From a paper:
The assembly (folding and membrane insertion) of OMPs is mediated by the heterooligomeric β-barrel assembly machine (BAM). In recent years, our understanding of the mechanism by which BAM mediates OMP assembly has advanced considerably. Unlike the β-barrels of most OMPs, which are extremely stable because their first and last β-strands are held together by a large number of hydrogen bonds that form along the entire length of both β-strands, the first and last β-strands of BamA are held together by only four hydrogen bonds that form at the β-strand termini. Biochemical analysis and cryo-EM structures of BAM-OMP assembly intermediate supercomplexes have revealed that during assembly the BamA β-barrel shifts from a lateral closed state to a lateral open state and thereby enables a conserved C-terminal motif in the substrate (the “β-signal”) to bind tightly to its first β-strand (BamA β1)25–29 in an antiparallel configuration.
CP1 and CP3 seal the lateral gate from the inside of the barrel via interactions with residues on both sides of the gate. Both peptides form primarily polar contacts with BamA, but with different residues. In both CP1 and CP3 co-crystal structures, Q466 mediates interactions with the peptide backbone. The suppression of the antibacterial activity of the peptide by the BamA(E470K) mutation strongly suggests that the E470-R4 interaction is important. Curiously, CP1 and CP3 lock the gate shut by binding to residues on both sides of the BamA β-barrel seam while CP2 appears to constrain the flexibility of the β-barrel that is required for the formation of a lateral-open conformation.
Residue numbers in the entry:
A (entry chain B): 2 to 16
B (entry chain A): 423 to 810
The structure:
Amino acid sequence: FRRYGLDNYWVXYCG
Amino acid sequence: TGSFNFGIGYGTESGVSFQAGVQQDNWLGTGYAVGINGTKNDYQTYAELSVTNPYFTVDGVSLGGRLFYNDFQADDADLSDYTNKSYGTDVTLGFPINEYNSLRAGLGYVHNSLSNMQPQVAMWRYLYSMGEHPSTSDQDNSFKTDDFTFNYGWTYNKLDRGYFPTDGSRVNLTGKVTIPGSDNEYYKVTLDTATYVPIDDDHKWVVLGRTRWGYGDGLGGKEMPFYENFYAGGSSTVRGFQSNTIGPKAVYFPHQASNYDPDYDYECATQDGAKDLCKSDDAVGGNAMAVASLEFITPTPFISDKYANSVRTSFFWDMGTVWDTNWDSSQYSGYPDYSDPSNIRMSAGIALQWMSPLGPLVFSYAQPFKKYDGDKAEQFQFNIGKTW
Ligand SMILES: CCCC[P+](CCCC)(CCCC)CCCC
Ligand SMILES: CCCC[P+](CCCC)(CCCC)CCCC
């Protein structure tokens, strides 16, 4: 995961 | 029993990352898994307390609550400068619709405390829409908001395995809207998709199609806050571009720099002779964003069949755009039109991933094939660990 402040972005590389 | 966890990672996107936490399933016999965790990287310190019951109903409807804190320094994320210290809480119900789908519905509260904002057009345009009129010639300022939101989500996950997927898709849709009584008035939606299509019977040649979309806007005359903007570019979105570089760039007002020193570089400093608005190459994000990628996974060359399942080789074409739907092009005719969604950035590259004993290692080398004025390239990118 990567955070953009409080927003979350699931990175495809972690799937 | 309770457990503690401590990790350290590194990547080109966020630098050294530190992770620390405690977790207890069925904490004190309550049926709630309780966690306390913190993270720190180049631009953010984040901490949270979470309490979740996976079986709020006997049918697996979950109820979770969270307390959180965020300290963010925008210049450290390669954006035009500002500091945000925020905190809040939320409560979320999770509904397992079927094997591969879940829905989420929640309520949230968030306090945002903005300060040290370097004056620039798009940011001041949002502030003006809120009735805030700070000076354009100084970075000493303050703006605080308190918002209440309804939050919703949908996740579809039918990926064939938890690492190196070869088939299936993962789709995540997240949205929110402010509730009357909030300082801000806006809605925001994000959609992420990753779809893998195997070509051969042995699933060694796979096509990945990936998309990411973001759209938010103000309700009424207020705009969506710039601290909720979308970004693109970097090791995990549009590879080969510097982190968050894609899209609008700050148009600075002439200002007296907070700690001037002729030994360092400043944006639109009066001490340097600035008497008018300055164009820059500092990204600010936008309220609209779209990213698309086509990636061809192939067998890894010169590696053993026994250790092939541990390494993934791929070749990709990444594409991305970010724009500001409220950019007033007619008022700023002497600057690029930041409201234009058609400035699509593109890059081509290669990626190598290794599920090492220590954890996931990802390396990529990509070259921008289409870029615009102010975009910064970062051809070689990498990440070590599970935080990006
Ligand atoms: C560790 C036990 C926590 C119980 P809850 C909080 C009690 C007051 C502080 C969990 C709420 C989740 C959103 C109340 C249970 C449901 C109404
Ligand atoms: C190999 C997977 C391709 C997945 P799609 C295309 C992605 C292009 C970058 C859909 C293709 C339909 C034929 C995902 C679209 C989601 C909004």
